[PDB]
């Protein structure tokens, strides 16, 4: 069993915790309880290989913004999450991307761009704009809903594949 250290990052309220708990427990969390730092484990077979995912669920609130280096050092791959009905969260993505690159001193960190809350009709970030950003980073873009499960396994397991091929 190979162990993979995944970290979920992004602005406050975009659904990092709901995405993680949907993956772990198959349950959608309706409450908005701001995270400080949580961790989860999941044994799962991906492409015929059993592994153990360690998932770090991080704080999006700006009051915690000075405490990120410590978790970025440990992570192998990062889900960079924004909400497709929140343009500011999409603009915040590049700050996370650049901080991860600085901390890990690398241009080539496994990442996936995630546009969450795709169950909501009132979109303000178009798929094309996010896809353009993902291409500029060399990473895939996956739209998800923590509410319906759409794309959730695809997002996490794509990140595993990118750590595996790194």
């Amino acid at each position: 069993m190979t162990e993979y250290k995944l970290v979920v990052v992004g602005a406050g309220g975009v659904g990092k915790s709901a995405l993680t708990i949907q993956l772990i427990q198959n349950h959608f969390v309706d409450e908005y309880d701001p995270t400080i730092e949580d961790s989860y484990r999941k044994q799962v077979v991906i492409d015929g290989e059993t592994c153990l995912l360690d998932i770090l669920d991080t704080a999006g609130q700006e009051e915690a913004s000075a405490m990120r280096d410590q978790y970025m050092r440990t992570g192998e791959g990062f889900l960079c999450v924004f909400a497709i009905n929140n343009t500011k969260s999409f603009e915040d993505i590049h700050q996370y991307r650049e901080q991860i690159k600085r901390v890990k001193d690398s241009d080539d960190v496994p990442m996936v761009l995630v546009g969450n809350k795709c169950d909501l009709a009132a979109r303000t970030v178009e798929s094309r704009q996010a896809q353009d950003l993902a291409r500029s980073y060399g990473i895939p873009y996956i739209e998800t809903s923590a509410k319906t499960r759409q794309g959730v396994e695809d997002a996490f397991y794509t990140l595993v594949r990118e750590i595996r091929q790194h």
Partner: protein, 469 residues
């Protein structure tokens, strides 16, 4: 330069690390032993977060610190004094100017705010995942509500208001799937006809599915509070470990029911059909990764009353002997193959709990509570980490639900199974062994013949599922 710290005289968590108060294992450090003050300092450390440590500590701390004392210590940790103005600040103020307060601002940003946030994260995890401390001590809950509800200042405000609400919700206290569950399967017994339900009249696929849902629910209900301190072995085990004991008693009852179905079928041909059907149920248990169910069957086949039934075993088809042999081999060599298989499958699964219990008990019995160093007694934290590695493995398999539909009548049938009736254990297991001797006597006594007891067809419908439109 490093930040200066409060004087250790006014703030106890600024004492320097030494081998008299903390010992590390040989990239965050791993603690082997320490004083409770040093453990709490590292639990809420300003340089890094340690979510594993938070779970380990909150799962195991009651063996070295009472809940009331833990709360006092983290409140003490939270209340960090701010440094005095520096010489440069002093000179600015003397000239009527605003000081830069560079060192004060850095100490707030890089010491106070991370430590305070990490104290709140301990409180949040304590309330969300270890709430039994507060259910069992109402005064402890009052103190936690008071502490959280009087934290001032806007940097912590979002988490203070959130934790307040989480506490109130916990005081008065839904699944979505990738696919649809398969259709419920029926054999001789038809829906609603609970009076005909039995081993051979329910569909063997649906027996395995409904027992798996029941055994999964029982597995998922066991909390760490039922395990730490080996409390399921002590005199108050019924009070402290009720979900674990309910889970084990279900497993014992099903094993005894399998044994009773076998030895109360006196006709040889009918008994062969009973044993074959139980091995088919075992096959579906294996397909479902219900290892508790697998071993319920293996235990029944290796019991004294069943194991000796050579005339029955001789007629079991070779492919079914092979299935049973493979399942038996999971237990051989101290569960070597079971452990490897559990670590390779794709959950959901139902683990066998017994190995976890033995390993927790032996870890607690085989390691000392304290380590003596330089005249000091340090809490042996490596021992608690080993226990929490086991409870963490247990919890990891508790997350994933089965995509199977409940059948309320079949569920109730297996919930109400009571093979022993009013008999005590020794009387009942002697009865089963005497039945075994009756139906297949010890050589050289001749093998008798017995009349059939089942009026319905014995042919199995098999264990491959069907799918109409």
């Amino acid at each position: 330069g490093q930040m200066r710290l409060p004087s250790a005289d006014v703030y106890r968590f600024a004492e320097p690390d030494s081998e008299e108060n903390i010992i590390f294992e040989e990239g965050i450090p791993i603690i082997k032993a320490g004083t409770v003050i040093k453990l709490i300092e590292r639990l809420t450390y300003h340089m890094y977060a340690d979510p594993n440590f938070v779970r380990t500590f909150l799962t195991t701390y009651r063996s070295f610190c009472k809940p009331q004392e833990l709360l006092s210590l983290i409140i003490e940790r939270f209340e960090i004094p701010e440094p005095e103005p520096t010489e440069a600040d002093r000179i600015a103020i003397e000239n009527g100017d605003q000081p830069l307060s560079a060192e004060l601002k850095r100490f707030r940003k890089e010491y106070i705010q991370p430590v305070q946030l990490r104290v709140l994260n301990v409180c949040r995890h304590w309330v969300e995942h270890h709430f039994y401390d507060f259910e069992r001590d109402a005064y402890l809950l009052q103190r936690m509500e008071e502490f959280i509800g009087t934290v001032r200042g806007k940097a912590m405000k979002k988490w203070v208001e959130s934790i307040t609400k989480i506490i109130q919700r916990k005081k008065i206290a839904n699944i979505t799937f990738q696919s649809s569950p398969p259709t419920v399967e029926w054999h001789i017994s038809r829906p609603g006809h609970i009076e005909t339900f039995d081993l051979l009249t329910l569909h063997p696929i649906e027996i395995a599915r409904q027992l798996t849902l029941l055994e999964s629910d029982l597995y998922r209900a066991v909390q760490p509070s039922e395990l730490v301190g080996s409390v399921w072995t002590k005199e108050d085990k019924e009070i402290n470990s009720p979900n674990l004991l309910k889970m084990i008693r279900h497993t014992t009852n099903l094993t005894l029911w399998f044994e009773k179905c076998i030895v109360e079928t006196e006709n040889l041909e009918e008994r062969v059909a009973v044993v074959s059907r139980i091995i088919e149920i075992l096959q579906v248990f294996q397909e479902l990764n219900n290892f508790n169910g697998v071993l319920e069957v293996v235990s029944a086949m290796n019991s004294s009353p069943v194991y000796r039934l050579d005339h029955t075993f001789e007629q079991i088809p070779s492919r079914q002997k092979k299935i049973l042999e493979e399942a038996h081999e999971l237990s051989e060599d101290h569960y070597k193959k079971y452990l490897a298989k559990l670590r390779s499958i794709n959950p959901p699964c139902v683990p066998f709990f017994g190995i976890y219990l033995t390993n927790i008990l032996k870890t607690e019995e085989g390691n000392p509570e304290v380590l003596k160093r330089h005249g000091k007694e340090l809490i042996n934290f490596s021992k608690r980490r080993k226990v929490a590695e086991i409870t963490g493995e247990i919890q990891q398999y508790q997350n994933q639900p089965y995509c199977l539909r409940v059948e309320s009548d079949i569920k109730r049938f297996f919930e109400n199974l009571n093979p022993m009736g009013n008999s005590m254990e020794k009387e009942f297991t002697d009865y089963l062994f005497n039945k075994s001797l009756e139906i297949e006597p010890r050589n050289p006594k001749p093998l008798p013949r017995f009349p059939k007891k089942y009026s319905y067809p014995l042919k199995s419908p098999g264990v491959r599922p069907s799918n109409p439109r």
